[PDB]
Design a protein around this ligand. Structure first.
Ligand SMILES: C[C@@H](O)[C@H](N)C(=O)NS(=O)(=O)c1cccc(-c2ccc3n[nH]cc3c2)c1
Ligand SMILES: C[C@@H](O)[C@H](N)C(=O)NS(=O)(=O)c1cccc(-c2ccc3n[nH]cc3c2)c1
Ligand SMILES: [Zn+2]
Ligand SMILES: [Zn+2]
Lengths: 403, 398
């Protein structure tokens, strides 16, 4: 079956070792993909008007007792101690986000406050359940919590729902199934609060014309969940996105704002992650493309090769020029024959391969080749640069000219 | 002027007793952090560094082999899973060596320069914590350079030049250089330390760099050049560092196929330019007294109306500047114009663009700076161009 663990070794993306179970060593080229995904999410955070923060890796166990995590996550939480106190390594970003909200006086005028983080979390998942990038102990969530009034729930859940379909469409995921995860057996909050949170999410889905199934007893301890599963090109299901309505944690953590009539009020909190674990999302993408990443995600977008020693200076000039123009480009000046070089970069799935022989030096042009074997012939360097810039800017799925 | 007070006033970050020495970065402070990462990335691109990311914890067994367990125990946070013990990472070096150890390397791959914005933790004594300067959770602009004996000079020189190159951008006038020599508890022979210490002094002298000795303060694995920066009370803080390590690669089985097909162990150079991102932000906060240069300022431009009558226009320009890459916010509040100007002056926002009825007809903007200087009427294209130029060149002034 397509396997990201094999593709990832082939393409030198990352590795794992038993010295750090379920924790990824990101090699240069894999980290390049991770960083480009973060650039993409940030573009969406800007458009959708989110803050971006960073909360600490560890906080005192007492805070985690207060939230309800200690009772409901105890087993899954890594603990460490210093000077007679115990700290939990964070399994979730939400408590940190509340501590940031709690700094200073908040007004109804500050709401809806949308707070995002690339949140680096750890959970002590059983070793026997771990699997490549898909099931890890250290994962990074494209997380956010929205602080809002009850009157704002509708519009904010809607914005989260749009964002899911918006973002998945960029990667070519258009087949999406939705579920509503209802009250678990171990939960905090009254049944009436639950009645209300569940109906709020059902109503949002209904008004969006999104059909769903129930997922009985699978909501969070703090609130119910809209869960979004995409299907890939092999029609495999991946549950990724989550939208969660929380009437419990803010009160538990003494969060408040001053309302219009100057009465003190507790905000509602919406939790959401669209990609889920970025580690897992990269694993899925690697399998979806079978290594043929779109140019905007490809770790190396262009390799420029000499025929021999003769054209080294020209290829060096070209490499520098394309790099200044923001393309991930490298020069292959090695000993070997032209066909040894192109095979190597073809198997590395580099989008474009520029060939530079004696006649290219004198014309100021490049012979352009793709990783799917297409001969794009001689091209001017400025044309090559402009078309790649356009491909990258637009985050296009396919290369030049095809169906 | 204290970074801690300024931090509160500009809403950059906070700390709490629930996590001593752990920073909560608010939006505006995280903004600064992120620009610094962009800047570091630009500088390392010209030097061909890779960028990686290693795990947050690794097995105690690995930390025993590196010598951290014996030479660094009280300073490490530990945790357990399924009866195995892990240290939360105090350093990124061992993780980088694990990546180097994947795949056969040859002399052709050297020098190999491997960088990481590495989030580490050290169990610093609580009484020694001080604001952003000394924290328990820190991020280094770290790198390790894997190289041959013959390449040490060149690569140490390259690190030294990178420190003065990057520091020139912020305009530091006082950079104190210390050479830190073998500590009491250390790994490696006295002969290795003789040769390591000599290489670093030779390198300083080759660049004609005035320096002092700081005996007994080097790392357990090797000597350190330290580039020292100073806070508003003139307290010293290590920022830049360049270190020479002939120990860890052998300890961790790193090797490469030489010129003559014999196996060799590479030399490692450790270096950080800014140091800790937290400490560096502390230093920059006091250095500039909050008036961050335009390229680093969390909000570069605030656009304000007088009344609801100009809102549409303020929104028009706010989307226009934003689309040009400028960090811009609209202030649409039913507050007096002098209340608005004072908040944004206090927040140290480089530029304030005021819009009344007059500006809506003319299609211009009234421009004022956080220094209270009146810049008069300007066209929106000239303001966009001025700013893109200040941002792109990363200028210190104006
Ligand atoms: C959405 C967040 O604000 C919420 N606080 C949360 O973590 N929800 S969640 O537990 O359902 C969640 C969301 C996304 C990812 C994960 C998660 C958790 C652990 C994992 N290991 N490998 C992949 C993993 C993914 C959990
Ligand atoms: C250069 C690195 O590769 C090296 N392995 C190292 O960690 N050297 S170092 O211990 O001297 C060092 C370098 C940079 C920052 C810190 C550091 C360490 C702990 C801190 N707490 N608050 C600010 C801190 C700064 C330590
Ligand atoms: Zn959450
Ligand atoms: Zn190091």
């Amino acid at each position: 079956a397509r396997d990201h663990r094999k593709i990832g070794k082939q393409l030198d993306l990352y590795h794992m070792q038993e010295e750090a179970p379920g924790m990824v060593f990101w090699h240069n080229d894999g980290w390049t993909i991770f960083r480009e995904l973060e650039v993409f999410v940030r573009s969406k955070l800007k458009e959708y008007q989110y803050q971006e923060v960073k909360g600490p890796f560890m906080m005192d166990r007492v805070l985690w007792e207060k939230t309800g995590h200690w009772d409901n996550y105890k087993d899954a939480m890594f603990t460490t101690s210093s000077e007679n106190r115990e700290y939990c390594i964070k399994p979730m970003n939400c408590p940190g986000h509340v501590q940031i909200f709690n700094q200073g006086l908040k007004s109804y005028r500050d709401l809806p406050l949308r707070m995002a983080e690339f949140g680096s979390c750890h959970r002590n998942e059983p070793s026997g359940s771990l699997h490549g990038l898909m099931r890890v102990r250290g994962f990074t969530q494209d997380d956010a919590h929205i602080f809002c009034t009850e009157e704002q729930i509708r519009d904010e859940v809607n914005g989260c729902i749009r964002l899911v379909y918006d973002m998945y469409s960029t990667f070519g995921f258009e087949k999406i199934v939705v579920k509503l995860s209802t009250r678990p057996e171990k939960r905090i909050g009254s049944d009436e609060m639950w009645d209300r949170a569940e109906a709020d999410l059902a109503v949002a889905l209904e008004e969006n014309n999104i059909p769903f199934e129930y997922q009985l007893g699978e909501g969070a301890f703090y609130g119910p969940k809209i869960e979004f599963t995409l299907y890939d090109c092999l029609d495999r299901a991946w549950q990724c996105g989550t939208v969660q309505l929380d009437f419990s944690l803010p009160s538990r953590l003494s969060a408040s704002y001053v309302g219009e009539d100057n009465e003190r009020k507790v905000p509602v909190m919406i939790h959401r992650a669209i990609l889920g674990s970025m580690e897992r999302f990269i694993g899925i993408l690697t399998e979806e493309f079978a290594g043929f990443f779109p140019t905007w995600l490809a770790p190396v977008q262009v390799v420029i090769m000499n025929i021999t020693d003769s054209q080294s200076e020209y290829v060096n000039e070209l490499t520098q020029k394309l790099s200044n123009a923001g393309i991930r480009v490298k020069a292959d000046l090695r000993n070997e024959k032209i066909g040894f070089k192109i095979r190597e970069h073809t198997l590395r799935r580099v989008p474009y391969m520029l060939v530079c022989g004696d006649k290219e030096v004198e014309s100021g042009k490049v012979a352009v080749r793709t990783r799917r074997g297409k001969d794009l012939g001689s091209m001017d360097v400025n044309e090559v640069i402009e078309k790649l810039q356009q491909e990258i800017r637009s985050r296009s799925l396919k290369q030049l000219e095809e169906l």
